[PDB]
């Protein structure tokens, strides 16, 4: 069921995985052609698509509170979905070279995202629970990039570097 | 039932050109959804059906942008900035169409999804400008306050998006495409208001709120709403040129930083080189 | 080795050397997985399947 | 069916697309070798050939009411069919290099004409419903060239410029 799981990963609803929009989920497993083990991993695979649409609502609220650094933080977050979406199209040719490969390699690529996607979701939840506005998102992400997780500490430094460029804009025009 | 796999995505790439169709139920502007069918119990179950629900929202904005097109110039040039940008969106559309008609194609559902992904971000910032643009059209008495607060939200959008980005100047120019063209008929009335002495303001809508009163002793009354000193230099000069027609006498983006208030502070001496030369003649 | 990388997660706590040690140990964990990628390609049809 | 659609676009009748002359159409789709989707776009493709023969009747009435500016308006309208007919012959070599290409590129070229051809058809319909005669076609086209649509505002300025040349003739011979 190769195409059903890449597209449950993009965040769009179904009637096997019934989804209303952007916050709510019903699992609906009265399914005959998956096993009781194999629906447990689809719940493991949906938790990495749940935070991906908890992410686009953070985009459309700021792109398309307030502040000039909120959307400066948005072109930081598009770079963390960019190898994510680059990995979504490399799974596409995997399903065309042989359309009989089972789901465990797709599980394997998403155990790679398993420590990037919650570790940024705990960041935005700590962001929205202090009700931050202005430069102090940049200080919040600076003590978040104080943390380790070497793929993630570069990622919260890339989100740091783009809104430091908007800081870099300011004292350039002021002088 | 079985619908055509890797060909329904070429048939949504179809829809995105010719926007009203039957494979996709874009019946109205508010609701654009796709239903193909559930496909079979091997070979791409539901992932491909999840991807079609994504692109349903991306054919939704182009149906909204075409519905904005109908057949002041400021409202028309803000409409033609939408349409002049479309041919840069329609050029890639024929590229991937040329790739899949040419065998072999070596593409699938997922390996095309990153090619239109830089365009995917460019079409969503198109949504934000026009959604924050029209919000008071079903309210009545729009005329000048709708023009003033949609220019304001255009200016609010260029402060939020250009000044935070600047890693790619290709979208920096794109938000300047929407600015320099809408301001140009808002300029060409000001050129007519000085070197010719008279201005054009329609009756159904209103613009910059300059209007000549019908008596001769009255000079000029500014409409009340119901750079700004440089606009007051336009007001006194066009008054003074209205007098004079009554008188019978005798490289890199990151070094260019940034961006629109520097060009505006170039336009104010361009206003200035006429405001400074009119008062010499007065 | 995998539970060592689960205990690895810090901001960067009590040492700049400690998890960079484990950064190389994830590289040596990574080398074990490529040697598992040759094994499964033996299993399906596309040698002998003996122990 | 490459040649059938360029020539349904020129405005001449058929017995699949039965057409009497210059005003009336029957769609007649009991067709086996087109799909129910593909006849809907032939109705989209016929609507750009319907106004093209609503156009030649405006020619033959004036060339071959009355006034000296009615046919001055005619050599304005031949310039708007001239890149149209230039595009008709560039589709011809498209059908000779490979005669297997389907109809969507021909749909694509006619979405380019989709905002030139109604926007001049609303002009001539507003012309004939006021029963205009003389200089006041030139004032009608001047507030039509007051409109935007940057390809079309140049087109109604080219139709403005040619009958302003007949105005330019008059005060040259009068002086």
Curated annotation (Swiss-Prot), chain C:
Q: Where is the signal peptide?
A: none
Where along the sequence do coiled-coil regions lie? Answer: none
Where is the protein found, in the record's own terms?
Answer: Cytoplasm, Cytoskeleton, Microtubule organizing center, Centrosome
Q: Which domain of life is it from?
A: Eukaryota
State the similarity comment: Belongs to the TUBGCP family.
What does the annotation say about its assembly with partners? Interacts with gamma-tubulin.
Give the function comment from the record: Necessary for the recruitment of gamma-tubulin to the centrosome and for the formation of a functional centrosome.
The name this protein carries in UniProt is Gamma-tubulin complex component 3 homolog
């Amino acid at each position: 069921m190769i195409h059903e799981l890449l597209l449950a990963l993009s965040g769009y609803p179904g009637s096997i995985f019934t989804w209303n929009k952007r916050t709510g989920l019903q699992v609906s497993q009265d399914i005959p052609f998956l096993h009781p083990g194999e629906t447990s991993v689809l719940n493991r695979l949906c938790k990495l698509g749940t935070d991906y649409i908890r992410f686009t609502e953070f985009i459309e609220q700021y792109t398309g509170l307030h502040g000039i650094y909120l959307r400066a933080f948005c072109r930081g977050l598009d770079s963390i979905l960019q190898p994510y979406r680059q990995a979504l199209l490399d799974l596409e040719q995997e399903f065309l070279a042989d359309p009989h490969l089972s789901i465990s390699h797709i599980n394997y690529s998403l155990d790679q995202f398993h420590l990037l996607f919650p570790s940024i979701m705990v960041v935005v939840e700590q962001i929205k629970s202090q009700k931050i506005h202005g430069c102090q998102i940049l200080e919040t992400v600076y003590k978040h990039s104080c943390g380790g997780l070497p793929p993630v500490r570069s990622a919260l430094e890339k989100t740091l570097a783009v809104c430091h460029g908007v800081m870099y804009k300011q004292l350039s025009a002021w002088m | 039932t079985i619908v055509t796999e890797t060909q329904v995505i070429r048939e949504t790439l179809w829809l995105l050109s010719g926007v009203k169709k039957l494979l996709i139920f874009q019946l109205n502007d508010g609701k654009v959804n796709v239903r193909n069918d559930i496909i079979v119990t091997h070979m791409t179950q539901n992932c491909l059906r999840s991807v079609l629900e994504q692109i349903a929202a991306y054919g939704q904005v182009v149906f909204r942008l075409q519905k904005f097109i109908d057949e002041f110039r400021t409202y028309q040039a803000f409409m033609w900035a939408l349409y002049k940008y479309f041919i840069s969106f329609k050029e890639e559309l024929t590229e991937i169409e040329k790739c899949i008609i040419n065998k072999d194609e070596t593409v699938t559902l997922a390996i095309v999804l990153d090619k239109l992904a830089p365009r995917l971000a460019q079409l969503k910032v198109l949504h934000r400008v026009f959604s924050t643009g029209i919000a008071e059209v079903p309210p009545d008495t729009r005329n000048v306050v709708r023009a003033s607060h949609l220019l304001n939200t255009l200016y609010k959008a260029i402060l939020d998006y250009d000044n935070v980005g600047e890693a790619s100047e290709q979208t920096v120019s794109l938000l300047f495409c929407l600015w320099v063209e809408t301001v140009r008929p808002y300029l060409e009335i000001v050129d007519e208001w000085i070197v010719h002495g008279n201005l054009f303001d329609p009756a159904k809508e209103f613009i910059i709120q300059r209007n000549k009163d019908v008596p001769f002793n009255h000079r000029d009354f500014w409409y009340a709403t119901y750079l700004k000193p440089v606009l007051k230099q336009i007001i006194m000069a066009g008054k003074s040129m209205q007098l004079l027609k009554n008188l019978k006498c005798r490289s890199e983006s990151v070094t260019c930083q940034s961006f629109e208030l520097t060009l505006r502070s170039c336009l104010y001496p361009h206003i200035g080189k006429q405001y400074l030369e009119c008062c010499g003649n007065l | 080795i995998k539970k060592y990388t689960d205990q690895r997660s810090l901001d960067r706590a009590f040492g700049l050397v400690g998890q960079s040690f484990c950064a190389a140990l994830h590289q040596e964990l990574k080398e074990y997985y490529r040697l598992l990628s040759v094994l499964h390609s033996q299993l399906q049809v596309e040698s002998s399947l003996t122990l």
